[PDB]
Structure 1
Amino acid sequence: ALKAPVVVLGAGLASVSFVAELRQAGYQGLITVVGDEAERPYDRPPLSKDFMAHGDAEKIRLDCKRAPEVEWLLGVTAQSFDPQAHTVALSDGRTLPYGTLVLATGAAPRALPTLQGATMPVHTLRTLEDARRIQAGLRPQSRLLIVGGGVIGLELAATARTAGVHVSLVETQPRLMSRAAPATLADFVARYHAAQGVDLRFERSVTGSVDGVVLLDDGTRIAADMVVVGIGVLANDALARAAGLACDDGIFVDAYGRTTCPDVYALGDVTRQRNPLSGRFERIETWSNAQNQGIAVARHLVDPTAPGYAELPWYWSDQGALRIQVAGLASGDEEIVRGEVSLDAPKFTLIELQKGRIVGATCVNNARDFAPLRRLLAVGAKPDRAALADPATDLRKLAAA
């Protein structure tokens, strides 16, 4: 159960949601949060979206007032922990004792070795600092090269195009968002960005760079004023690895957030956990997971009577005129398409089925359907394939089941 004092490593969304929930649940004991970034806790989603526009960090801070009497050690790095002695060594020379240790260290952007020593600016996008630097280079008429067709790269592509920047995007895979989205969506998104002026290149890899020019594996080249690398992230599990916990690009935890080390828990982007829909363990790198997992784990720690974490995964993406919401699995037995997939008036819904059962849903500029669909997904609904296809009200079908 809960043993005081509580020490949380990392001051991101997972950590903030966890501590707030502890207090809300009733834990009145000591809570200390260690965050290496010298910044008032903030939200990351805005960084590749609205923030690139207003540059106002005060519009993206997280609400830490819901977590009364918590000491936040900002600008401090947890260098290591001793599971035997139950202590944490900090970069400022101090040591913190703990009853319960929570690792919410997130993940960090993977680097591109071929660009080691590029004569032009090469950035990754994870922190407020990264965002400020990138935002500064988004001048009109400049040439931006984005390596990686994931949601964050595409959101930045859309943002940059709006600022009058010329954007080129290189992806090793034959499609965009190859990991997190259904093929139908990836095809439409590619078409949308192409139509926006984005120079997309699939199945191309960066091999190197010479005098301000990026070289591709197909013997061609691309001159860029700035390069932004977004080819995925790696779990910040170094402390857990050194302390002997089970890790493989992420700390393994069960539904209670427990690691293989007693009194040590983990939450957020840094964890490999069971995907309830696929039954497999994976790292779920979403905003809702960081928040929901932090809450679920805090609740069970205060009350073992509470159930383990069981929320289904979902995320959203804002890419220019596209408001994308994706829940569950990207593929299944069959796919139902509601509405029309038109570049002109994009507004459709995709439903992924697995033997009559809803296992996934995508909504593009159709938020009204997302809520019900998530409910249907939650109960493993198996609705009428026909009713599902023809313009029925999901809110209604959802209500029934």
Structure 2
Amino acid sequence: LKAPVVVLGAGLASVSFVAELRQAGYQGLITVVGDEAERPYDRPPLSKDFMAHGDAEKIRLDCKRAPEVEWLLGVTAQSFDPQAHTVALSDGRTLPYGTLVLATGAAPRALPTLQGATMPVHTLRTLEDARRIQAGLRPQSRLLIVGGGVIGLELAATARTAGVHVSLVQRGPRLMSRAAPATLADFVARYHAAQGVDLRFERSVTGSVDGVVLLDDGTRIAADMVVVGIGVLANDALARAAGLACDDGIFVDAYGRTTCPDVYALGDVTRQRNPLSGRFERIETWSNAQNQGIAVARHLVDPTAPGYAELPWYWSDQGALRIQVAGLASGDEEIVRGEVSLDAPKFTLIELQKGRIVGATCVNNARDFAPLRRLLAVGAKPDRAALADPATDLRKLAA
């Protein structure tokens, strides 16, 4: 850890990082460069409570645990010179660094077919996005969402609840293709359909003409607004130009090291090792953003601390469903605790691979999720009849 410390990006990863630095004992300079002119804020309300109530001061990140940090807000880092150890800012200034940390997150993928569209076409990543979307969402408006991921589905539920007609187009055969078990996805589809979401599977957007959307089946949807949610791309441009190893994401080891000396990276912008699959992936979860930021910071202050080791997990609030997914989506067996019914949805999925717990889903069942993550974390091999038996208490099982 060489002073001063410069962090590029001011999302949850960056805030968690600089906070931990200060908690761990680092008392030298920290400068954070954030391109949004916004007091650092959390993103998940943007599809739920913020979209509904509109209060941005309810979603700001607590910077309290990060004292003596200069936050250059509304400034874009344009390049860095890894030899000179400087960063070049959009306002003409230059920042020196001993240690440069890239926490630049990711930006929504654009839809090429709507590239020159004549109707409102938004993505949903920022406070600015949310406000703009929120403002074309009168009740009884007609909203099209492209993409069946968690963002689209969260928005869908939040919009239906308002009284918006929602139609969702998904090019695959199922929702939540990224890290959701099939069972969960079938159910999730079934829930939103029962809420009045018009689902289109196996469909692609081919273009648009005057407030109407064209699909690859020759059909048509008329929309008052279109929200695209087909995934994100890492903001790694700076890394690519300075010569770091990248492929839609900056490669880092478990200490957050890039291939460039004195340059680290964390959060959504990173491709890292998934300890379960063994493969490198861009883990774009909230918990990763925070937990990886902390791990990397902790190891910079105390090199004897371990590298980042957390198994991946996330939640997703979609209307009445509080969904929690941990680990892998499938193994060689799935055990279902409880019943899968739209009538009072509450159930638990456990995914097993040669007897070891490798994944878990809790829908409306937080009580079960935490002990499953503990059992998942130490690759436990419990009796499957006990795992299936409703009488079993999972919290107890975990000791």
Residue 91 of structure 1: aligned partner: 90
3-state SS, counterpart of residue 64 of structure 1: coil
Residue 119 (structure 1) shift: 1.6
Task: Deviation per CA, 1:253-282: give whole Å up to 9, x if none.
Answer: 000000000000000000000000000000
For residue 65 of structure 1, give the secondary structure of its aligned residue in structure 2.
Answer: coil
Shift of the 125–231 alpha-carbon distance from structure 1 to 2, 3 Å rule, reads same
Moved more, 114-123 or 243-252: 114-123
Alpha-carbon distance between aligned partners in 1 of 2:394 and 2:384, rounded to the nearest angstrom: 16
Write the distance in 1 (CA, Å) between the matches of 2:218 and 2:105: 37
Q: 1:156-210 deviations in whole A, cap 9, x for unaligned?
A: 0001101111000000000000112000000000000111110000010000001
Instruction: Provide Cα deviations, 1:1-29, integer angstroms capped at 9, x if missing partner.
Output: x0000000000000000000000000010
C-alpha distance in 1 between matches for 2:140 and 2:387 = 46
CA contact (8 A) 2:32 2:71 kept: yes
Instruction: Name the CA distance, whole Å, in 1 between partners of 2:393 and 2:296.
Output: 32
* Counterpart-to-counterpart distance in 1, 2:287 and 2:366: 16
CA distance in 1 between partners of 2:13 and 2:94 (Å) = 23
SS at match of 2:135: helix
- Residues 372 and 394, structure 1, Cα contact 8 Å, conserved in 2: no
**Structure 1 residue 296 displacement after superposition:** 0.3
1:73 aligned counterpart, secondary structure: strand
Report the CA distance shift for 1:396/1:230 in structure 2 as closer, same or farther (over 3 A): closer
- Secondary structure at the aligned position of 1:129 is classed as helix
Structure 1 residue 53 displacement after superposition? 1.1
Is residue 275 of structure 2 the alignment partner of residue 276 of structure 1? yes
Cα separation, 1, equivalents of 2:68 and 2:313: 32
Residues 1:350 and 2:356 are matched in the alignment:
no
Q: Distance in 1 between matches of 2:177 and 2:103?
A: 27
192-201 vs 133-142, which moves further: 133-142
Partners of 2:76 and 2:118 in 1: how far apart? 31
Distance 1:179 1:64 in 2: 31
Distance 1:178 1:240 in 2: 28
In 2, the alpha carbon distance for the partners of 1:28 and 1:121 equals 47
Q: Is the 8 A contact 2:386 2:392 kept in 1?
A: no
Task: Assess if the C-alpha contact under 8 Å between 2:212 and 2:223 holds in 1.
Answer: yes
CA deviation after TM superposition for structure 1 residue 396, in Å: 3.8
Name the % identity: 99
CA contact (8 A) 1:34 1:73 kept: yes
CA apart distance, 1:391: 1.4
In 2, are the aligned partners of 1:255 and 1:309 still within 8 Å (CA)? yes
Report if the CA contact (8 A) 1:373-1:394 is conserved. Answer: no
**Alpha-carbon distance between aligned partners in 1 of 2:22 and 2:211, rounded to the nearest angstrom:** 52
Deviation at residue 138 of structure 1 after TM alignment: 1.4
Q: Confirm or deny: 8 A CA contact 2:368 2:395 kept in the other structure.
A: no
Give, in angstroms, the shift of residue 395 of structure 1: 4.0
Deviation at 1:393, TM superposition (A): 3.9
CA-to-aligned-CA distance 1:272-321 (integer Å, 9 cap, x gap) = 00000000000000000000000000000000000000011100000100
Instruction: Compute the RMSD of aligned alpha carbons.
Output: 0.8
CA deviation profile, 1:43-91 (whole Å, cap 9, x unmatched): 0011001111110000000001110000000000000000000000000
User: What SS class does the counterpart of residue 14 from structure 2 fall into?
Assistant: helix
Could you say what secondary structure the match of 1:175 adopts?
Answer: coil
Report the alpha carbon displacement of residue 394 of structure 1 after superposing the two structures with TM.
3.9
1:255–1:308 CA contact under 8 A, matched in 2: yes
The TM-score, its normalising length taken from structure 2, stands at 0.99
Aligned counterparts of 2:180 and 2:47: Cα–Cα separation in 1: 19
Alpha-carbon separation, structure 2, partners of 1:396 and 1:206:
46
2:209 & 2:288 partners in 1: Cα distance? 41
Provide the rounded CA distance (Å) in 2 between the counterparts of 1:49 and 1:369: 24
Structure 2: distance between partners of 1:393 and 1:69: 50
Contact in 1 for aligned 2:173/2:201 (Cα 8 Å): yes
